[PDB]
Amino acid sequence: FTSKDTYLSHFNPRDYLEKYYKFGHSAESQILKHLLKNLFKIFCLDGVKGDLLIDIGSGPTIYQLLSACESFKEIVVTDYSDQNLQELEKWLKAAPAAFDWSPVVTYVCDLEGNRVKGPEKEEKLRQAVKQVLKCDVTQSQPLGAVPLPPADCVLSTLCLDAACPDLPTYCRALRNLGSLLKPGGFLVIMDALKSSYYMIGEQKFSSLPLGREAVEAAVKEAGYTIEWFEVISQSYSSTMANNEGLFSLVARKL
Numbered sequence: 001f002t003s004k005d006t007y008l009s010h011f012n013p014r015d016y017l018e019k020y021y022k023f024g025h026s027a028e029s030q031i032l033k034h035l036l037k038n039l040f041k042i043f044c045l046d047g048v049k050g051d052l053l054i055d056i057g058s059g060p061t062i063y064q065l066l067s068a069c070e071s072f073k074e075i076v077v078t079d080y081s082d083q084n085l086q087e088l089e090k091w092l093k094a095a096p097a098a099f100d101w102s103p104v105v106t107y108v109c110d111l112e113g114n115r116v117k118g119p120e121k122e123e124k125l126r127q128a129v130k131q132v133l134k135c136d137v138t139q140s141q142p143l144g145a146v147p148l149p150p151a152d153c154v155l156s157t158l159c160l161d162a163a164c165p166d167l168p169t170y171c172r173a174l175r176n177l178g179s180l181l182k183p184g185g186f187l188v189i190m191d192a193l194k195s196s197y198y199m200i201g202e203q204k205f206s207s208l209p210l211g212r213e214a215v216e217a218a219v220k221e222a223g224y225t226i227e228w229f230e231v232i233s234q235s236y237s238s239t240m241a242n243n244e245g246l247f248s249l250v251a252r253k254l
């Protein structure tokens, strides 16, 4: 299985964004649309809200925070890769080399009923993100020495399957994310099903191939109660990954 040090050195953030999030009718854009609709449902319709949301394994992406910034005063973004956090920071600071998220932002504005336009939505997200932190989900203290208040919600999109080499580590990671959550707080996970790798160009990265039953069992083992669980059949392009759909779940910490 891919060593975690490979993420520091070989995960190219700009290449990842170009391959998966350009949003130019690709499998990658169909998956992105589905993820955005579910995140809108959770944070805007279901009213998952609070003072603090921690996004775990954010990579260099912000799409997973666009609806969340309407419901949370503060968002903390985290990743194992320092290069990924620097790419995020380019967008947060509105630096010239920042990735163009405007088609994704417009799509979320449309989903939300065109209450606001792209620039207002972006400013709301930029104001919500106060901290950009290193994290390691495999550790009992994922945020290391950095203290944070217990969060109202922990979100993790397409991270846990890449971070966990086996099922015991995956259950342990759910427990470690739980240490960041307030009692009764929400856990929101979205990831690929039955995927054993993903590609960024010629660079291969391992993935833990879990089925829906093993994911649900691990969340219950780790001390959560599931509110809803959805499986989609849509898979990534054959050149990208070997998954059999994706899942999304919302649970509460016991």
Ligand SMILES: C[S@@+](CC[C@H](N)C(=O)[O-])C[C@H]1O[C@@H](n2cnc3c(N)ncnc32)[C@H](O)[C@@H]1O
Residues within 6 Å of the ligand: 004, 007, 011, 056, 057, 058, 059, 060, 061, 064, 079, 080, 081, 084, 135, 136, 137, 138, 156, 157, 158, 159, 162, 163
């Ligand atoms: C496939 S990307 C998902 C990125 C983003 N959340 C998205 O939805 O596109 C996997 C992310 O997991 C991060 N990662 C890998 N191992 C990790 C670990 N042990 N702890 C935290 N993050 C880790 C990588 O650095 C990378 O940003």
Ligand SMILES: COc1cccc2c(=O)ccoc12
Residues within 6 Å of the ligand: 020, 158, 159, 161, 162, 192, 195, 196, 197, 198, 207, 208, 236, 240, 241, 243
């Ligand atoms: C967009 O990122 C991905 C694309 C496809 C598959 C995976 C995976 O199996 C684990 C982590 O990330 C993935």
